[PDB]
């Protein structure tokens, strides 16, 4: 047994000393994109990969082969979409060029990136039994998009998978498919956007144009977000994806403590930096089952901790402004006290 512990520590130093020869490769499957609510495809924190310790100078064909065996899929029934970190702070699936990129090593394909994250497109093994296969993809003339539905009622995003389609296609021709995937009746009146990056969510105006023209900088892994064109949306809190990604971009968590209760640990509230007095007051009053009119809030002292000046209710400002004196680390807190009836 003591020998076996000398073989265990020893072999693990080789792997430590050989790790510079190896790279990790993180595979992510479309199931992982389901029910994600944030920008792009998935949350890097909540995502679950299928990892692979792989030789830096090994060939692609080798990985492809290996993969097909580990996961359990034919080699012609899977396609790889390497994840790309773009200039604009998004991470999307990008293409990879089998033909021109056929006789290159792994590490170089990652562009010296490690770990290297890769989207695995496989045919649903359920639909695969029923005669289906992974379609052909004219790199030059087809594009791969991703579809997201937004429900203003629930204020949520519902992944609707990806589609291959030809670049030349009109947007009007992809409406059915969107309706279907979202489970709407055909000829349902929709509203479409491009998720471009966080905070930026441009509306698509002319449907009767080619995809080329319709998304500024068309590329694979572009994301169309769509919803119902319905009056009921006005009722909601966030009728557009555009608004959603704002609330999300400006989402920030704030702790609230009773000034009158010494050392009160208080309660967090998730709020938006572009709120005004009213929106912050009304939020917290819902969390205290109280009239907002009975809440007095207090500004930040900047340097010292503890409640500062008493915040008047005609405060023309935004929460960004209230929080502006908290270092990145510093937890974001605001003091309040209740008033009398």
């Amino acid at each position: 047994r003591l020998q076996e512990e000398k073989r265990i520590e020893a072999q693990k130093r080789k792997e430590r000393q050989e790790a510079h020869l190896y790279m990790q490769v993180q595979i992510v499957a479309e199931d992982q994109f389901c029910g994600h609510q944030g920008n792009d495809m998935y949350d890097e924190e909540k995502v679950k990969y299928t990892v692979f310790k792989v030789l830096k100078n090994s060939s692609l064909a080798e990985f492809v082969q290996s993969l097909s065996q580990t996961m359990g899929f034919p080699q012609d029934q899977i396609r790889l979409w390497p994840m790309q970190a773009r200039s604009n702070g998004t991470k999307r699936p990008a293409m990879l060029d089998n033909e021109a990129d056929g006789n290159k090593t792994m590490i170089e394909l990652s562009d010296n990136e490690n770990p290297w994250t890769i989207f695995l497109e496989t045919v649903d093994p359920e639909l695969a039994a029923s005669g289906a296969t992974l379609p052909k993809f004219d790199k030059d003339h087809d594009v791969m998009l991703f579809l997201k539905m937004y429900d203003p009622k629930t204020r949520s995003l519902n992944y609707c998978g990806h589609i291959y389609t030809p670049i030349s296609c009109k947007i009007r021709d992809l409406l059915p498919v969107m309706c279907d995937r979202a489970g709407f009746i055909q000829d349902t009146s929709l509203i479409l956007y491009e998720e471009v990056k966080p905070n930026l969510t441009e509306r698509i105006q002319d449907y009767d144009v080619s995809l080329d023209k319709a998304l500024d900088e068309l590329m694979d892994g572009d994301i169309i977000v769509f919803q119902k064109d319905d009056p009921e949306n006005d009722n909601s809190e966030l009728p557009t994806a555009k608004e959603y990604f704002r609330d999300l971009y400006h989402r920030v968590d704030v702790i609230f403590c009773d000034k009158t209760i010494p050392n009160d640990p208080g309660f967090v509230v998730t709020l938006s930096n572009r709120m005004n007095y009213f929106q912050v007051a009304k939020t917290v009053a819902q969390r205290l089952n109280t009239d907002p009119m009975l809440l007095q809030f207090f500004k930040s002292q900047g340097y010292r901790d503890g409640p500062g000046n008493p915040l008047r209710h005609n405060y023309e400002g935004t929460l960004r402004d209230l929080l502006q004196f908290f270092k990145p680390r510093q937890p974001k807190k605001l003091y309040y006290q209740q008033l009398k009836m």
């Binding site: 604009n88 003339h141 594009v143 030349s168 080619s210 080329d212 900088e217 590329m219």
Partner: peptide
């Protein structure tokens, strides 16, 4: 024909 971009530039 109609192509996609190589690179996003915003």
């Amino acid at each position: 024909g109609p192509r996609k971009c190589a690179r996003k530039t915003r």
